Design an enzyme around this catalytic site. Structure first.
Site, short mmCIF file in Angstrom:
data_model
loop_
_atom_site.label_atom_id
_atom_site.label_comp_id
_atom_site.label_asym_id
_atom_site.label_seq_id
_atom_site.Cartn_x
_atom_site.Cartn_y
_atom_site.Cartn_z
N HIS B 95 97.42 86.20 127.72
CA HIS B 95 98.00 87.50 127.39
C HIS B 95 97.22 88.20 126.27
CE1 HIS B 95 99.60 84.99 124.17
NE2 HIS B 95 99.80 86.11 123.50
N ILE B 96 97.17 89.53 126.32
CA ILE B 96 96.57 90.33 125.25
C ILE B 96 97.43 91.56 124.94
CG2 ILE B 96 94.18 89.62 125.70
CD1 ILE B 96 93.85 92.31 127.21
N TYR B 158 89.39 94.52 119.95
CA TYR B 158 89.47 93.61 121.09
C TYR B 158 88.42 92.50 120.95
CZ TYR B 158 89.26 91.90 125.91
OH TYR B 158 89.24 91.11 127.04
N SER B 159 87.24 92.89 120.46
CA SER B 159 86.09 91.99 120.34
C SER B 159 86.26 90.95 119.23
CB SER B 159 84.82 92.81 120.12
OG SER B 159 83.66 92.01 120.23
N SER B 161 88.99 89.76 118.05
CA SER B 161 90.01 88.78 118.41
C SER B 161 89.48 87.76 119.41
CB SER B 161 91.27 89.47 118.95
OG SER B 161 91.06 89.95 120.27
N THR B 195 91.66 94.01 137.67
CA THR B 195 93.09 94.14 137.44
C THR B 195 93.41 95.61 137.20
OG1 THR B 195 93.11 93.95 135.01
CG2 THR B 195 93.05 91.90 136.30
N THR B 197 95.08 97.12 134.91
CA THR B 197 94.93 97.54 133.52
C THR B 197 93.46 97.70 133.14
OG1 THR B 197 97.02 96.45 132.86
CG2 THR B 197 95.50 97.07 131.11
N1 LIG Z 1 90.66 92.51 133.50
C1 LIG Z 1 89.55 92.52 132.73
O1 LIG Z 1 88.77 93.45 132.81
C2 LIG Z 1 89.26 91.42 131.78
C3 LIG Z 1 87.94 91.23 131.34
C4 LIG Z 1 87.69 90.20 130.45
C5 LIG Z 1 88.73 89.40 130.02
N2 LIG Z 1 89.96 89.60 130.45
C6 LIG Z 1 91.01 88.71 129.95
O2 LIG Z 1 91.90 88.25 130.99
C7 LIG Z 1 93.25 88.16 130.45
C8 LIG Z 1 94.18 89.05 131.27
O3 LIG Z 1 93.55 90.32 131.39
P1 LIG Z 1 94.43 91.24 132.38
O4 LIG Z 1 93.48 92.21 133.13
O5 LIG Z 1 95.15 90.36 133.42
O6 LIG Z 1 95.46 92.10 131.46
P2 LIG Z 1 96.81 92.57 132.21
O7 LIG Z 1 96.65 92.61 133.69
O8 LIG Z 1 97.19 94.05 131.72
O9 LIG Z 1 98.00 91.52 131.88
C9 LIG Z 1 98.27 91.47 130.47
C10 LIG Z 1 99.49 90.55 130.32
O10 LIG Z 1 99.91 90.36 128.95
C11 LIG Z 1 101.31 90.68 128.84
N3 LIG Z 1 101.60 91.17 127.50
C12 LIG Z 1 101.29 92.40 127.00
N4 LIG Z 1 101.70 92.51 125.77
C13 LIG Z 1 102.31 91.35 125.40
C14 LIG Z 1 102.93 90.89 124.23
N5 LIG Z 1 103.02 91.70 123.12
N6 LIG Z 1 103.44 89.66 124.22
C15 LIG Z 1 103.36 88.88 125.28
N7 LIG Z 1 102.78 89.27 126.40
C16 LIG Z 1 102.25 90.48 126.51
C17 LIG Z 1 101.56 91.76 129.93
O11 LIG Z 1 102.91 91.77 130.43
P3 LIG Z 1 103.95 92.71 129.62
O12 LIG Z 1 103.39 94.04 129.29
O13 LIG Z 1 105.24 92.92 130.56
O14 LIG Z 1 104.39 91.95 128.27
C18 LIG Z 1 100.67 91.20 131.07
O15 LIG Z 1 101.37 90.20 131.82
C19 LIG Z 1 93.19 88.67 128.99
O16 LIG Z 1 93.04 87.58 128.08
C20 LIG Z 1 91.92 89.52 128.99
O17 LIG Z 1 91.36 89.57 127.68
C21 LIG Z 1 90.26 90.57 131.30
C1 LIG Z 2 85.57 96.26 129.64
C2 LIG Z 2 86.11 94.93 130.14
C3 LIG Z 2 87.65 94.98 130.32
N1 LIG Z 2 88.37 94.94 129.03
C4 LIG Z 2 89.75 95.06 129.09
C5 LIG Z 2 90.56 94.03 129.59
C6 LIG Z 2 91.94 94.16 129.65
C7 LIG Z 2 92.52 95.33 129.19
F1 LIG Z 2 93.85 95.46 129.24
C8 LIG Z 2 91.75 96.36 128.68
C9 LIG Z 2 90.35 96.23 128.63
C10 LIG Z 2 89.46 97.31 128.09
F2 LIG Z 2 90.12 98.42 127.64
F3 LIG Z 2 88.68 96.89 127.06
F4 LIG Z 2 88.61 97.76 129.05
C11 LIG Z 2 87.93 93.96 128.02
C12 LIG Z 2 86.42 94.04 127.81
N2 LIG Z 2 85.77 93.87 129.14
S1 LIG Z 2 84.50 92.75 129.28
O1 LIG Z 2 84.43 92.03 128.03
O2 LIG Z 2 84.67 92.05 130.53
C13 LIG Z 2 83.06 93.78 129.39
C14 LIG Z 2 82.04 93.41 130.26
C15 LIG Z 2 80.90 94.20 130.36
C16 LIG Z 2 80.78 95.36 129.58
C17 LIG Z 2 81.81 95.73 128.70
N3 LIG Z 2 81.67 96.92 127.94
C18 LIG Z 2 82.59 97.62 127.20
N4 LIG Z 2 82.04 98.67 126.63
C19 LIG Z 2 80.75 98.59 127.03
N5 LIG Z 2 80.47 97.55 127.82
C20 LIG Z 2 82.96 94.94 128.60
#
Ligand SMILES: NC(=O)c1ccc[n+]([C@@H]2O[C@H](COP(=O)([O-])OP(=O)(O)OC[C@H]3O[C@@H](n4cnc5c(N)ncnc54)[C@H](OP(=O)(O)O)[C@@H]3O)[C@@H](O)[C@H]2O)c1
Ligand SMILES: C[C@@H]1CN(c2ccc(F)cc2C(F)(F)F)CCN1S(=O)(=O)c1cccc(-n2cncn2)c1
Ligand SMILES: NC(=O)c1ccc[n+]([C@@H]2O[C@H](COP(=O)([O-])OP(=O)(O)OC[C@H]3O[C@@H](n4cnc5c(N)ncnc54)[C@H](OP(=O)(O)O)[C@@H]3O)[C@@H](O)[C@H]2O)c1
Ligand SMILES: C[C@@H]1CN(c2ccc(F)cc2C(F)(F)F)CCN1S(=O)(=O)c1cccc(-n2cncn2)c1
EC number: 1.1.1.146
Lengths: 260, 258
Positions: B95-96, B158-159, B161, B195, B197
């Site tokens: 979660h984030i 975000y970075s 953390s 995803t 988001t």
């Molecule tokens: N998708 C990407 O682009 C991407 C890239 C790199 C890394 N990641 C990592 O993958 C993981 C999931 O990303 P995601 O795309 O799946 O985000 P996500 O789809 O928006 O899911 C985020 C989850 O966190 C929960 N959450 C939000 N606020 C919270 C709070 N205050 N306390 C507890 N839970 C909370 C949300 O549910 P609720 O709002 O109902 O609480 C939701 O289930 C994260 O660690 C993210 O950093 C994602």
């Molecule tokens: C941009 C995505 C999705 N993000 C994400 C995940 C969940 C969220 F809920 C929200 C985000 C975000 F808003 F950062 F996009 C988290 C950061 N990442 S990442 O670390 O996979 C990534 C890969 C390659 C390039 C980048 N760049 C960002 N600026 C420039 N390059 C980031």
């Protein structure tokens, strides 16, 4: 990035803040800055040792020298201090973030107080200070110096809380640096990765639990030169070759593959 | 070496499981007949996830709802979830705090919040789960990002953390090697995943080729199952290759001798 060999004169009349400058390396950086005739403002929690330090900066040749006692745990003091020290020097050219909370070598069990304290002091205060210093640094096209560690680049045991904050510094300021490039902000950001340095605090925590320490004086100078010359990263460690393994070419590429 | 029967009857916690990759991992775990306990803030959606998990073949599936902004909730959620499952074998931290793509603008509240939710709660959850995990010789799986390995603009807080997670969990991983604590730590470095988001946060500005959230989840799960140290998942193979850092490993060993 200044394409130039360093010259002490670069700091003559430069207005500089040094945090965590009541002892260790922060004290060292102050002296060096004094000798170069810079305006210095030092800070820390102990008003006593700070005076001792100010006293000596003056007599080394500082253009001026002030101390402001406070605790960086208090986010309201961090913001205030930077404005106080802005008044005291009539501006700001360099911001040296050096201070850290009292850490020691220990296995991590349940010390969640210390993990949060570490973040707050070692990392989150740096960001506040920075936000407060920025308006003035932009005016003087100045520099931000952030002092970090090997533990902020690779994983060692018994410094988890500490290492977490130093890693956090890397990620945040590196990302900000990228932002200053795009945003065209002309304020340098230098991250210093220091190996074991023979500060009073360091040597106590390390002894018995077996490596080699580098001189705090050259260390303080190196930090200041990397700052003056506006370098991205500064390395320092007893071993020279060690410093060579720290740079990461792969990181350099991944950062570009997503710029454009 | 991986085979879904590895999770069969494994007590697993997945956080941020109401949407995105968290949601997808629960579903994967539910086809493998894992015992699963999910969480997030939204019970409405968490209910939808819990029913679907049972249809899929979950040994059992329940949710507990709260905000991870609350370190008290986080500490209790893990007791309550472990007590319900009679133990814990795997802890998936995923979660984030809600993040958007923005230049830093002195929003310290957001930086603090990001550290609190994305990082400090991960440690609280870990401290709370450790006893049960030492007991099951299980695993902690931390979900991170490319931005947790290299620097980009628009994602400073975000970075920080995500970087914090690496430095903490990688350091404790080394601590568990010399303490003979038998619980694996898997840091997962993920690029852009499709995803909802993610795709609403980037697609506005410049965008990339987004990997599939479903497969991403399975890779996260497999990685942890095999007790690997890191797990990279990105569209490009040219990314995976670069994410690895060989010098670091060498330094880590070099001053480990002590
Ligand atoms: N998708 C990407 O682009 C991407 C890239 C790199 C890394 N990641 C990592 O993958 C993981 C999931 O990303 P995601 O795309 O799946 O985000 P996500 O789809 O928006 O899911 C985020 C989850 O966190 C929960 N959450 C939000 N606020 C919270 C709070 N205050 N306390 C507890 N839970 C909370 C949300 O549910 P609720 O709002 O109902 O609480 C939701 O289930 C994260 O660690 C993210 O950093 C994602
Ligand atoms: C941009 C995505 C999705 N993000 C994400 C995940 C969940 C969220 F809920 C929200 C985000 C975000 F808003 F950062 F996009 C988290 C950061 N990442 S990442 O670390 O996979 C990534 C890969 C390659 C390039 C980048 N760049 C960002 N600026 C420039 N390059 C980031
Ligand atoms: N020396 C090394 O071996 C080594 C290795 C790697 C990295 N580093 C980095 O180099 C820097 C200095 O190391 P060091 O050995 O010189 O540290 P130090 O000897 O322990 O002195 C640290 C400074 O921080 C100040 N400080 C402590 N708590 C504070 C608080 N709550 N608020 C404000 N100031 C506070 C202390 O003054 P007061 O306590 O009186 O307030 C002191 O001036 C640190 O950033 C460290 O991460 C050092
Ligand atoms: C050991 C020194 C001094 N430390 C420090 C600085 C100022 C202090 F006030 C207190 C400390 C500390 F107690 F952490 F040692 C912070 C950590 N560093 S370091 O990152 O330069 C480093 C270099 C080489 C090896 C290690 N190892 C850690 N475990 C095994 N090797 C750490």
């Amino acid at each position: 990035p200044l394409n130039e060999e360093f010259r002490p004169e670069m700091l003559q009349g430069k207005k500089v803040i040094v945090t965590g400058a009541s002892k260790g390396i922060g004290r060292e950086m102050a002296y060096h800055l004094a000798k170069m005739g810079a305006h210095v403002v030092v800070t820390a929690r102990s008003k006593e040792t700070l005076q001792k330090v100010v006293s000596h900066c003056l007599e080394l040749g500082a253009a001026s020298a002030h101390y402001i006692a406070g605790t960086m745990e208090d986010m309201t003091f961090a913001e205030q201090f930077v404005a106080q020290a802005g008044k005291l020097m009539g501006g700001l050219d360099m911001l040296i973030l050096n201070h850290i909370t009292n850490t020691s070598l220990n296995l991590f069990h349940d010390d969640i107080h210390h993990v949060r304290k570490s973040m707050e002091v070692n990392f989150l205060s740096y960001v506040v200070l920075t936000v407060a210093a920025l308006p003035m640094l932009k005016q003087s096209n100045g520099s931000i110096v952030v002092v970090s560690s090997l533990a902020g680049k690779v994983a060692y045991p018994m410094v988890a809380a500490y290492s977490a904050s130093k890693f956090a510094l890397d990620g945040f300021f590196s990302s900000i640096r990228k932002e200053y490039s795009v945003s065209r902000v002309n304020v340098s950001i230098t991250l210093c990765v220091l190996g074991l340095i023979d500060t009073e605090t360091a040597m106590k925590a390390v002894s018995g639990i077996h490596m080699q320490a580098a001189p705090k004086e050259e260390c303080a100078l190196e930090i200041i030169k990397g700052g003056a010359l506006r370098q991205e990263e500064v390395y320092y460690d007893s071993s020279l070759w060690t410093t060579l393994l720290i740079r990461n070419p792969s990181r350099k590429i991944l950062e570009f593959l997503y710029s454009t």
